[PDB]
C-alpha cells in the first residue's frame, strides 16, 4: 500500500492510500532538555519528537525544523521522518510508495535534498511530490476554480481552468498562522501578561484556536468594545485565569490588513484573490469567480468565509456574484486529495522509480512531478 | 442524397440537397492548448475544431486554415472536413455526392489539392466545384444581373447576361470582413482599450456585428459626434463595460474608402460595380444597372443597401435608375443556390466521376466545372 | 531658450536646445513615508520626488506615475513637472518654449490633459509634442530606416522612407524593461532570495544593469551552465553577498521569446522588425533592411546588436544583408534629436501658440503635431 | 518653569528645564520601622522616603514601589512624588508643566493611573509622557541610530532612521541591574558570606558598583583565576573585611549569557542589537550599525563598550564596521534629552492640557504622547 | 559492603547498604571535663564522644562541631568520625565505600576539606557526596515533587520534575530545631524557670519532643488558654516538677512566623514552598502542588502536616488541590534513600576513586557528585 504524508510547517499528517482521513496527526517539533539530570532511574532520552515533546515541554526547548515551507535543519528533519515511519505507521519503508507535498515557488535545493534522503537513507522504491493547492481541488471533485491555501507558514493562490494550469497567476506571501501567534503574544502585553519562552508560545496558540474570531465590521466592533469592554476568561495550565478583551478579533484582522505586522505592501486575502484572477484571461474570469475554494487550518476562524465574500464583492464588477466554498473539513483537504490521486489507475506510471534516480540523479525530480 | 458544403474563409455551412437552409453552421477554426495539463481526470484533447474551440478559447490559440480564400495549411484543413462528415452530418462519405464552392481567379493548385484529398482520403464517388457568385443568381431565380459578394476574405463582382458569362469583366479585391475586424481593433485603442490575443479578436468581431452601422452622410456624421459625443455601452465577458463612440460608423466606412487601411488604389464598393459594368458591352449595361444583387455576410450592415444605391446614381448617366436587390436572407444565398442547382435533372451528367480522375488525373477538374 | 524634456516611463531627461546632452537625468518616482515621525527637529517633508526619494527609500513607498507610457495619476505627474522646472532647471516656465515626447498609438485623452496642464497651470507661451522614434532618426542624420525603440514601458517600431511616414506599418507591444525586472525577481527565488517591497525592486534593477547579458546561443549556454554551474557574487546594500547563476542570460532572453512571461502571441524583437518591413511596399524593403536603428535603454545589453543581426538574417531572403546600427550613446538619442529639431529655422512656425489654444481648445493638438 | 522628572525602577532624577544636569538624585524607596518605639523624646516618623530611609536602614524594612518598570503599589508611589515636589524642588505643582518618562510596551493601565494622579491629586496644569530611549537620542544631537538602554528593571532597544520610528523592531527583556544584585548575593555564598535582609541588599549593590568589571575573554579569565586565585578586600559597615574572588567578573557576565539566571532563551546584549537591526529594512541597516548608543546605569561597567563592539563584529558581515558610542555621562542621558526637548519652541503645542482631560478622560494620553 | 553515613547538625546515622534502617544513631557532640580529678582509680578520659558524653553531662561542657550545616571545628569533627568507624561499625575503613550527604548551597571549602580527610586520614578507596533532599525522593519511589527538609540547623526546599533538576528554584533559610530550643528556653523564664548551661539545654530539647504541638488555629488557641489556663507537668531529672502552659504551642509557631525570633523577612514554611513553586515554569506547577514531601526531624510535631496543607490552600488558586505527603518514618528518609541509591548497578561508575583524587586534587569533587 502507498503512504501519503502531508508535511507542512506546523503539523504532520500520515496515512495510507484509499482511506478517508489520516490516522496520525502530530505537531512537527523536536525538543531537547535544558537542565541536567538529577536522578538515576529515569528513562529519559536526549531528543523528543512529536507528542512526547509537547507533553514534557516544561523542561524542554522546542524547535520547528521547517520555517516558511523551507527546511532549515536537515538533521532534525530526518528525526521527524524516522519517527513517522517506525513509531506511527510501524512499517518497513522499503515496501511502500511515498507521496509528498510542497508549496509552489520553493527553492530547488529544498526538493533535491528531500529526494536524496528518501532514496538513500530510507531506500524507498518509488516517490512522487505534488503541489498542495492542486491536491485540494481533487478532494472537491472539480477541475475549475481558484484555491486559497493558508497553513502555518505560507499562503498561496493557484487558479486552474478545465484542468489546465495558469503558471503566471500564482501568488505567494509567506505569512500565515505562526505570524498570527506572535502578534497575539505582543498585543497581549497591553493587559499585563508576558510570555517569552517557546513552551509559553504553545499556550498562546491554544488561545487563538478557541477564542479568536473574525469581525464582520471591524471599525464598528472596536467602537462597541471601547464602551462595553466585555471580556472573556481563559484558564492557564497552572490554575490562574487570564482575561481577553478586544484581542479576540484584532488577531485575525492581520489576514485582512498585513500592515499591522509591518508588511505594508502585501495585499491580503481579498486582494490576493482579486489580483490573481485579473492575470489569467478575460474569457476565464467569470468561471473563477464562481468557485473560490478555502483550504488550510488558518481559514478556520469563525465568520471568515462570510467576511471574505463581502470584501470581494466590493472589488468585482456589478454583474459578478462571487461564491466562496468552505468545506467543514477543509483542514484535511490536501491529504484527502492526495489519497484520491494515488488511487487512480492512470497514476501508476507517474511514480519516480529508484532506478531512474540512479542514472539521472537528483535533478530528475524537476523533469517529472509537474 | 447529395451534400452541399459552402466553405469560406470564416464559416462552414453544410447540409443536404433539396433543403431550404443548411442545418450546421460553425466557425472554421482549429485550437491548440498553450499550457500544460495539471489534473489527471480530464478528457482533454490535443486539437479542438469548430464550436469546441470557440467555447474553450480562454486556454487555446486559434488559427484559420483559409486566408483570402486560399488554403494555407492542408493538415488543419483535413481536420475541419473530417469534423464535418463524421460529427456534424454523421454520414459515410463513400455514398454521397459532394458539391463545393470557390472564389474566382484562385490559383490552380488550390483546386487540384482539394480534388486529390476528396477522392483519395475520403473516397467520394463523384465531385463538383462551382463559383460562388453564380450560385447566388440561382437562389434569386434570374439569369441577368451583376452580383457583389463580400464574405470574410474576398470581395468579387461577376456580371451575367441571359445566362452567358462575361469573363473579362470579373473583379476581385481581397479585402473583406476580417480586415474590418483588425481596423476596429486598432482605432479602439484611441479610447484606451487594447486587445492583442486571438481569443480577444473574437470579442471584437461580436462588437462589429452588433453595434456598427453605415452612415448615410459620413462627413456630417463626424461633425455631429464631435459635439454630442454620444456613446454606447458594451458588456465584456468578464463583466466590465466598454464604451464605443464614433468607431461604430467609422469601421464599415472602409468598404467605401479603402485608403483608410492603406489600399490607396483599390476602388471600393460603388466603383467596383461601376468599373465592372463599363467593361461588358454597350447593349448590355442598362439591364445590368437594373439588377444589382448583394450577397455575403459583410453586406449585412444597417443602411448599406441604401448608401450603395445613392453612390452609384452619382456615377451613372442621368437617364439610368440603378436598383439594388438585398434579400433579407442573403447570408445563405450561395448555399441555397447550390441546393437548387444540384437538384436539377439536367445536372446529373455534370458530376466528375472517380473513374475519370483515375485516368486523366487531377487536371480533369479544369476541363469540367466551367 | 527652448526647453527639451524627454519624459518616459522610467526616467526624466531635461535640458536646453542646442546642447549636446541633457544636464539633468533623474528617476520618475514619488515617495511617501509609511511610518510616523518620532523626533521634532527634523526637516522631513510629506512627499519626496526624484533623487530625494531614491536616497531615503528605506522608509518610503515608491510609485511610478506613468505605466506603459500612459499617465495613471495626474496629481503626482504635476509634482514631477514642478520639480523639473523649479529645482532642476531653475527657470520661470512663462518665458520658454517646451518640447515634449510621446509614444505612438497612445490614447487621445493622454495628449489632451498634458496640453491643458502646460497652458493653464504653468502658463507656457508655446508648446509642441513629438513622436519618440522620429526624433531618433534626426540624431543619426538620416531620412531612411526603421527604428526599434525599447525603454521602460513600451517597445515600438516605426519605418520611414525618404522622409515620408508609413502609418500602416507601425507596431507596439507594451513590454519593456520594467517587465524584465519583475521576471528577474521571480526566477531569483529559485536560489532562495525573496524581494517583495518597492524599495527592494530598485536593488533588482541594479543587478540587471550590471550582470545580465545576451547569450549568442541560448540552448548551448544553458547546457554549459548545467555542468560548470559558474556563478557571480553581488554585494547587497546591507553587506551580504548574493550569488547569481544562469539568471544572468535568462532575464534578457524574454526580449527574444515573450512566452516566458505569458505573452504567448507577441512577436519579439526579430519578428517585430520583420513583420513591420513586410507591410510597407516591395520597392522600399531593401533600403529598410540596410538601416535598422536601435534606441532606448533596454537595448543596452551586451551582445544584443550581434544576436539581433543573426536572427533577422535567418528570416530575410538569401540576397539580403541586414545591417544593424547601434550608437554607443543610444540611451539619449530621443533627447538629442529633439534638441536638433527645435534649433532649425524652419521649425519656428510649428510651435502651438497659447492664443490658438484659447480659441480651438485642447483638440488643436491633434490637428498640429503631425 | 517646566519640571523634568526621570523616574525609573531604581532612582529618581528631578530638575528644571534648561539646566545641564538634574539637581536632585535619590533612591526610589520607602521604609517602615519593624520594632516598637522605646523612648519618648524622639522625632520618629512612621514612613521614611528617599535618603532618610537609606541612612536609617538598620531599623527599617525597605520596598521599591516600581518593579520591572510597572508600579505595584500606588499608595507608596504618591509618597515618593509628594516628597519630590515639596521637599526636593520645594515648589507649588499647580504652576509648572511636568514631563515624565516611560519604558516602551508597558501596560496601558500604568499610563492611565499616572495621568489621573497628576491631574486630580496635584492639579498640574499640563502634562506630557515620553519614551526613554527616544530622549537619549536628543542628548546626542543625532536623528539616526539604535539605542540600548539598561537601567535597574528593564532593557530595551529602539532603532530610529532620519527621525522616523520603526515600531516593529522594538525589543524588551525585563532583566537589568536588580537581577545582577541578586545573582551576586547568591554566588557570594560559595565563599561563606550570607546576606538575606533588604538592608543587606543595599550593601551588595555597593560592592557591584565598585569592584565588578567585564572580562574581555571570559574563558581565559576563569582559567587564570583558578591558579592565581587573586582576591580583593572590601570593608563592611561594621568594620569586618570581605574577600571577593572571581565573583568580580562573573556577575556582569549575566548581561552576555542570561542562561546563568534561568533565562535560557533571552538573547543578551549582542544578540538583542543584532536581531533588532535585521528587522528594519535592508536599505537602513548600514547606517544603524554605525551609530550604536549606550544609555543607563547598567552600562557603566568597565570594559563593557569594548566587549560589546567585538561581539557584534563576529555577527555582522565582513564589510560592516560596527561603532559603539558610550558617552562618559550616559547615566543622565534620558534626563538631559528631556530638558532639551521641553525647551524647544515647537514643543509648546504638544502639552496635554487639563481642560482636554476633563472632556476626553484618561484615554486622551494614548492619542497624544506619540 | 558500602557504608552510608547521614551526618547532620544534630545526629549521626550510620549503617550498611541494603539495610532498611540504620543500626547506630547517636548525638553529634563532644564533651570535656570542667573540674579537676579527685580520685586515682577512675578510668576517666579527657574527651567524650556520643552517648558517653550524654550520660556524664553533669560534669562536662558540650559542643556541637557542626552549626547550620557547616563544620566549625575540624579537630572535633575527626573525633566523631573516628568514633563511628571503630566503635560503632567496628570496621576497617580501607575496605569499604563511603557515601556522605550535604545541604545545598554550602560553601565550597566545606566539601573540599571533607574529601581531604576521608582520603588521607582514613584511606577510603572510593567516595561520594549527595544532596539530602534528592535522597528523600528515592525513598518515596517517585521522580516528581518538591521536598521540604528541616533538621537541626537548616531548612531547604528542592523541586524536581521527571528526574530533572530546577537549580534556580532552590531555597535555604538556616533556621531549624536548634533555634526552636533556644526560643523555648527564653519564654520558659516567664514562669520562673531559668536554664543556662549546655547540659540544661539537653533537658529543654526533651521537653520540646514530648509536649509541644502545632495549633490548628493559633489566635483562638491563645484566647482559650488565657481563660482556662490549663497546664501540664513535666518531671525534671532531680525529681522536681515543672509546669508548662501555652509554651507548648507557641514554640513550634516559629516555623510559621519567623519574626518571633527576629527573622522579620524570612518566609516560613507555607511561603517557602509557595515561592519555590512559582519560580519553576507554568507547565510544571500543577504536578508540584500534587506531591509535597516532608522530611527531617523538625517536621515531626503533631498537627504539622494538617496545618501546612490548609495554609498552602489559601495561597494557591481556587482550582488547585495541594496534597502533602508525610511518611510516618520520615526522620530516616535521607538515610533510606541513600541505601537504595548505592545499591543500584548503574551507580557503580559514579564512585570517586582515590587514584583520580591523586591527580586532579580536591577540586575533583565539584566536577563529579552532581
Ligand atoms: N480552529 C482554528 N482556528 C484558527 N487557527 C487554527 C485552527 N486550527 C489550526 N489553526 C492553525 O493552523 C496552523 C496549521 O495549519 P495546517 O495547515 O493544519 O498545518 P500546516 O501549516 O503544517 O499545513 C497552525 O498555526 C494553527 O495555529
Ligand atoms: N450582421 C453582420 N454585420 C456585419 N458583419 C457580419 C454580420 N454577420 C457576419 N458578418 C461578417 O461576415 C463574415 C463572414 O461572412 P460569410 O460570407 O458568412 O462567411 P465566409 O466568408 O466564410 O463565406 C465574418 O467576418 C463576419 O464578421
Ligand atoms: N545598461 C543597461 N542594461 C540594461 N537595461 C538598462 C541599462 N540601462 C538602463 N536600462 C533600463 O532601461 C529602462 C529605462 O530606459 P530609458 O529609455 O532610458 O527610460 P524611459 O523608459 O523613461 O524612456 C530602465 O528599465 C532600465 O532598467
Ligand atoms: N558604576 C556602576 N556600575 C554598575 N552598575 C551601576 C553603576 N551605577 C549604577 N549602577 C546600577 O544602575 C541601576 C540604576 O540605573 P539607572 O538607569 O540610573 O536607574 P533607573 O533604573 O531608575 O533608570 C542600579 O541597579 C545600579 O546598581
Ligand atoms: N518528635 C519530635 N518533635 C519535634 N522535634 C524533634 C522530634 N524528634 C527530633 N526532633 C528535632 O529534630 C532535630 C534533629 O533532626 P534530624 O534531621 O534527625 O537531625 P539532623 O539535623 O542532624 O539531620 C533536633 O533538633 C530535634 O530536637
Ligand atoms: Mg497544509
Ligand atoms: Mg461566402
Ligand atoms: Mg525613452
Ligand atoms: Mg533610566
Ligand atoms: Mg537530616
Q: What is the CATH number of the domain that holds D188?
A: 3.90.640.10
Nearest-CA distance from A260 to chain D in Å? 9
Contacts of A200 (CB under 8 A, 6+ apart): E282
Counting ligand 1 atoms within 8 A of each CB, the residue from A7, A69, A201, A297 with the most, and so the one to mutate, is: A297
d(CA B277, CA B170): 10
DSSP string for residues in E4-30: EEEE-SSEEEEEETT-SS-SEEEE--E
CA atoms within 13 A on the CB side of E284: 25
d(CA E128, CA E339): 13
Which atom in ligand 1 lies closest to the alpha carbon of residue A208? 4
Residue C87: closest CA among C21, C3, C24:
C24
Is the CB of C197 less than 8 angstroms away from the CB of A108?
no
Q: Which residue has the cell 552576555?
A: D256
D90 — alpha (psi -120 to 50), left (phi > 0) or beta?
A: left
CA–centroid distance, residue E293 to ligand 10 (Å): 14
Cell reading at D283: 536599505
Rounded to 5 degrees, what are φ and ψ at B118? -65, -40
From chain C, pick out residues whose CB is under 8 angstroms from the CB of D143.
39, 41-42
Nearest-CA distance from A260 to chain E in Å? 30
d(CA E138, CA B337): 112
Q: Which residue has the cell 518605639?
A: D37
Does ligand 1 come within 6 angstroms of the Cβ of A22? no
Helix D74-83 × helix D108-120 angle, to 10°: 50
d(CA C93, CA C71): 22
Torsion over CA of E70, E75, E76 and E77, rounded to 10 degrees? 50
d(CA B297, CA B292): 16
User: Using an 8 Å Cβ cutoff, are C254 and C183 in contact?
Assistant: yes
DSSP lists the bridge partners of residue B139 as: none
d(CA E341, CA C132): 94
Sign of the dihedral defined by the CA atoms of residues C105, C110, C111, C114, in that order: negative
Does ligand 4 come within 6 angstroms of the Cβ of D211? no
Cell reading at E242: 515543672
Q: Is D241 exposed, middle or buried (0-12, 13-18, 19+ CB in 10 A)?
A: exposed
Provide residues with CB under 6 Å of ligand 3.
C 8-11, 151-153, 177-178, 205, 208-209, 296-298, 300-301, 331
Q: How far is CA D253 from CA D249, D260, D269, E338, in A?
A: 7, 9, 10, 37
Rounded to 5 degrees, what are φ and ψ at E26? -145, 155
Chains B and D physically touch (3 or more Cβ atom pairs below 8 Å): no
Is the CB of D163 less than 8 angstroms away from the CB of C203?
no
Does ligand 1 come within 6 angstroms of the Cβ of A253? no
DSSP lists the bridge partners of residue A4 as: A15, A99
Does ligand 1 come within 6 angstroms of the Cβ of A296? yes
Pick the residue whose CA is nearest to atom 8 on ligand 2: B297
DSSP one-letter code for A140: H
Q: How far is CA C273 from CA C149, C227, D208, E349, in A?
A: 11, 36, 82, 87
Ligand nearest to the CA of C80: 3
d(CA B227, CA E263): 103
Does ligand 5 come within 6 angstroms of the Cβ of E331? yes
Interface test with B, best of C107, C154, C172, C259 (most B CBs within 10 A): C107
Sign of the dihedral defined by the CA atoms of residues A121, A126, A131, A135, in that order: negative
d(CA B343, CA B338): 9
Residue E178 host element (H or E): helix E177-187
d(CA B107, CA B129): 14
d(CA E269, CA E273): 6
User: Using an 8 Å Cβ cutoff, are B99 and B3 in contact?
Assistant: yes
SS3 B58: helix
SS3 B74: helix
Does ligand 4 come within 6 angstroms of the Cβ of D13? no
Rounded to 5 degrees, what are φ and ψ at B284? -115, -20
User: Using an 8 Å Cβ cutoff, are C17 and C339 in contact?
Assistant: yes
Is the CB of A34 less than 8 angstroms away from the CB of D105?
no
- For chain A, the 3-state helix, strand and coil shares in percent, each to the nearest 5, are 40, 20, 35
Residue A105: closest CA among A162, A160, A154:
A154
Rounded to 5 degrees, what are φ and ψ at B265? -120, -5
Pick the residue whose CA is nearest to atom 24 on ligand 1: A152
**Parallel, antiparallel, or unpaired for β D352-353 and D126-131?**
antiparallel
Full residue range of the structural domain in which residue E187 is found? 177-256
Contacts of D282 (CB under 8 A, 6+ apart): C58, C199, C200, C203, C236, C237, C238
Count H helices, E strands: chain C? 14, 19
d(CA E352, CA E359): 12
The 8 Å CB, 24+ separation contacts for B277-286 are B277/B146, B277/B159, B277/B169, B279/B166, B279/B168, B279/B169, B280/B159, B280/B161, B280/B166, B280/B169, B284/B159, B284/B161, B284/B166, B286/B320
Q: How far is CA E273 from CA D134, E278, E286, E306, E324, in A?
A: 43, 9, 13, 15, 11
Which residue does chain B place closest to C263, by CA atoms? B197
Sign of the dihedral defined by the CA atoms of residues A81, A86, A89, A91, in that order: positive
Rg (CA), chain A: 22
**Parallel, antiparallel, or unpaired for β D292-295 and D70-71?**
unpaired
Residue D305 host element (H or E): helix D304-313
CA atoms within 13 A on the CB side of C103: 29
Nearest-CA distance from E317 to chain A in Å? 6
Q: Centre a 10 Å sphere on the Cβ of residue A76 and count the other Cβ atoms it contains.
A: 19
Counting ligand 3 atoms within 8 A of each CB, the residue from C152, C179, C203, C302 with the most, and so the one to mutate, is: C152
Sign of the dihedral defined by the CA atoms of residues B310, B313, B315, B318, in that order: negative
Rounded to 5 degrees, what are φ and ψ at B273? -70, -40
Q: Is C3 exposed, middle or buried (0-12, 13-18, 19+ CB in 10 A)?
A: buried
Is the CB of C261 less than 8 angstroms away from the CB of A105?
no
From chain D, pick out residues whose CB is under 8 angstroms from the CB of C199.
281-283
Cell reading at E275: 515561592
Rounded to 5 degrees, what are φ and ψ at B66? -105, 130
SS3 D31: strand
Cell reading at E263: 527573622
d(CA E7, CA E102): 8
Helix C108-120 × helix C74-83 angle, to 10°: 50
User: Using an 8 Å Cβ cutoff, are C296 and C149 in contact?
Assistant: yes
Residue A98 host element (H or E): strand A98-102
User: Using an 8 Å Cβ cutoff, are A99 and A4 in contact?
Assistant: yes
DSSP lists the bridge partners of residue D233 as: D243
Rounded to 5 degrees, what are φ and ψ at E144? -135, 135
Edge-to-edge strands of the sheet including D48-49?
D48-49, D30-33, D60-63
Which residue does chain E place closest to D182, by CA atoms? E168
Ligand nearest to the CA of E338: 10
Which residue does chain C place closest to A363, by CA atoms? C226
Residue E100: closest CA among E134, E131, E139, E146:
E131
Torsion over CA of A114, A119, A121 and A124, rounded to 10 degrees? 110
Does ligand 5 come within 6 angstroms of the Cβ of E258? no
Residues of D with CB under 8 A from a CB of C: 134, 137-138, 143, 160-167, 280-286, 316-320, 341, 344, 346-347, 370
Cell reading at D244: 571577593
Residue C6: closest CA among C106, C102, C137:
C102
Which residue does chain A place closest to C62, by CA atoms? A265
**Parallel, antiparallel, or unpaired for β B145-150 and B292-295?**
parallel
Contacts of C96 (CB under 8 A, 6+ apart): C1, C2, C3, C124, C125
Q: Which residue has the cell 571533607?
A: E114
d(CA E112, CA E365): 7
The 8 Å CB, 24+ separation contacts for D146-149 are D146/D273, D146/D276, D146/D277, D146/D288, D146/D291, D146/D292, D146/D293, D147/D293, D147/D295, D148/D269, D148/D272, D148/D273, D148/D292, D148/D293, D148/D294, D148/D295, D148/D299, D149/D295, D149/D296, D149/D334
Residue C131: closest CA among C273, C334, C333:
C334
Q: Where are the alpha helices (DSSP H) in chain C?
A: 51-55, 74-83, 108-120, 132-140, 177-187, 198-211, 218-228, 247-250, 269-277, 285-289, 304-313, 333-342, 354-360, 364-367
Is the CB of A347 less than 8 angstroms away from the CB of B235?
no
Q: Centre a 10 Å sphere on the Cβ of residue A328 and count the other Cβ atoms it contains.
A: 6
d(CA B258, CA B260): 5
DSSP string for residues in D42-85: ----S-EETHHHHHTGGGEEEE-SEETTEES-HHHHHHHHHHII
Which residue does chain D place closest to C241, by CA atoms? D317
Show the CA angle centred on residue B64, arms to residues B61 and B67, nearest 5°. Answer: 145
Torsion over CA of B133, B138, B142 and B145, rounded to 10 degrees? 0
Contacts of E123 (CB under 8 A, 6+ apart): E93, E94, E354
DSSP string for residues in B306-368: HHHHHHHHTTS-TT----EE--TTGGGHHHHHHHHHHT-GGGGG--EEHHHHHHH-TTHHHHS
Resolution (A): 2.7
Contacts of A106 (CB under 8 A, 6+ apart): A69, A70
Show the CA angle centred on residue D285, arms to residues D281 and D288, nearest 5°. Answer: 125
Q: Centre a 10 Å sphere on the Cβ of residue C195 and count the other Cβ atoms it contains.
A: 17
User: Using an 8 Å Cβ cutoff, are E77 and E63 in contact?
Assistant: no
d(CA A258, CA A261): 6
State chain D's maximal CA–CA distance in angstroms. 74
| Distance from the Cα of residue A293 to its chain's centroid | 15
Q: Where are the alpha helices (DSSP H) in chain A?
A: 51-55, 74-83, 108-120, 132-140, 177-187, 198-211, 218-228, 247-250, 269-277, 285-289, 304-313, 333-342, 354-360, 364-367
Q: Which residue has the cell 528644571?
A: D16
Residues of A with CB under 8 A from a CB of E: 33, 35-42, 44, 56-59, 197, 199-200, 203, 235-241
Torsion over CA of E308, E312, E318 and E321, rounded to 10 degrees? -50
From chain E, pick out residues whose CB is under 8 angstroms from the CB of A239.
285-286, 316-320
Nearest-CA distance from D196 to chain E in Å? 8
CA–centroid distance, residue B227 to ligand 7 (Å): 39
Rounded to 5 degrees, what are φ and ψ at C316? -75, 160
Residue E111 host element (H or E): helix E108-120
Residue E244: closest CA among E189, E178, E176:
E189
Q: Strand (E) positions, chain E?
A: 3-7, 11-16, 24-27, 30-33, 48-49, 60-63, 66-67, 70-71, 98-102, 126-131, 145-150, 155-161, 164-165, 171-172, 232-235, 241-244, 292-295, 324-325, 352-353
DSSP lists the bridge partners of residue B325 as: B293
Nearest-CA distance from E342 to chain D in Å? 28
Nearest-CA distance from C49 to chain D in Å? 17
Ligand nearest to the CA of D154: 4
Q: Which residue has the cell 537602513?
A: D284
d(CA B76, CA B99): 20
Counting ligand 1 atoms within 8 A of each CB, the residue from A6, A10, A28, A65 with the most, and so the one to mutate, is: A10
DSSP lists the bridge partners of residue B49 as: B30
DSSP one-letter code for A88: I
Rounded to 5 degrees, what are φ and ψ at C3? -110, 135
| Distance from the Cα of residue D140 to its chain's centroid | 18
Is the CB of D191 less than 8 angstroms away from the CB of E105?
no
CA–centroid distance, residue E296 to ligand 5 (Å): 7
Amino acid at each position: 500500500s502507498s503512504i501519503v504524508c502531508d508535511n507542512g510547517s506546523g503539523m504532520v499528517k500520515a496515512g495510507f492510500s484509499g482511506d478517508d482521513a489520516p490516522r496520525h496527526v502530530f505537531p512537527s517539533i523536536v525538543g531537547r532538555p535544558k537542565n541536567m539530570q538529577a536522578m538515576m532511574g529515569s528513562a529519559n532520552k536526549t531528543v523528543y519528537v512529536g507528542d512526547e515533546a509537547q507533553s514534557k515541554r516544561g523542561v524542554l526547548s522546542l524547535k520547528y525544523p521547517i520555517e516558511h515551507g523551507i527546511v532549515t535543519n536537515w538533521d532534525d528533519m530526518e528525526k521527524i521522518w524516522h519517527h513517522t515511519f517506525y513509531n506511527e505507521l510501524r512499517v518497513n519503508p522499503e515496501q511502500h510508495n511515498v507521496l509528498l507535498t510542497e508549496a509552489p515557488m520553493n527553492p530547488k535545493q529544498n526538493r533535491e535534498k528531500m529526494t536524496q534522503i528518501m532514496f538513500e537513507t530510507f531506500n524507498v522504491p518509488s516517490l512522487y511530490i505534488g503541489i498542495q493547492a492542486v491536491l485540494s481541488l481533487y478532494s472537491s471533485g472539480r477541475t475549475t476554480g481558484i484555491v486559497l491555501d493558508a497553513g502555518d507558514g505560507v499562503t498561496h493562490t493557484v487558479p486552474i481552468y478545465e484542468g489546465y494550469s495558469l503558471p503566471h497567476a500564482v501568488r505567494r506571501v509567506d505569512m500565515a498562522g505562526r505570524d498570527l501567534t506572535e502578534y497575539l503574544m505582543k498585543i497581549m502585553m497591553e493587559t499585563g501578561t508576558t510570555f517569552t519562552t517557546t513552551a509559553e508560545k504553545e499556550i498562546v496558540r491554544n488561545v487563538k484556536e478557541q477564542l479568536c474570531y473574525v469581525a464582520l465590521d471591524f471599525e464598528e466592533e472596536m467602537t462597541n468594545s471601547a464602551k462595553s469592554a466585555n471580556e472573556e476568561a481563559f484558564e492557564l495550565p497552572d490554575g490562574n485565569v487570564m482575561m481577553v478583551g478586544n484581542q479576540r478579533f484584532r488577531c485575525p484582522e492581520v489576514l485582512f490588513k498585513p500592515s499591522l505586522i509591518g508588511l505594508d505592501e502585501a495585499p491580503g486575502f481579498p486582494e490576493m484573490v482579486y489580483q490573481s484572477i485579473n492575470k489569467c484571461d478575460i474569457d476565464v474570469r467569470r468561471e473563477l469567480y464562481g468557485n473560490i475554494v478555502l483550504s488550510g487550518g488558518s481559514t478556520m476562524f469563525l465568520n471568515l468565509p462570510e467576511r471574505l465574500a463581502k470584501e470581494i464583492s466590493n472589488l468585482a464588477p456589478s454583474s459578478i456574484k462571487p461564491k466562496v466554498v468552505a468545506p467543514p473539513e477543509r483542514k484535511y483537504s490536501v491529504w484527502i486529495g492526495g489519497s484520491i490521486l494515488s488511487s487512480l489507475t492512470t497514476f501508476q506510471t507517474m511514480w519516480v522509480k529508484k532506478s531512474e534516480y540512479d542514472e539521472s540523479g537528483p535533478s530528475i525530480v524537476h523533469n517529472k512531478c509537474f
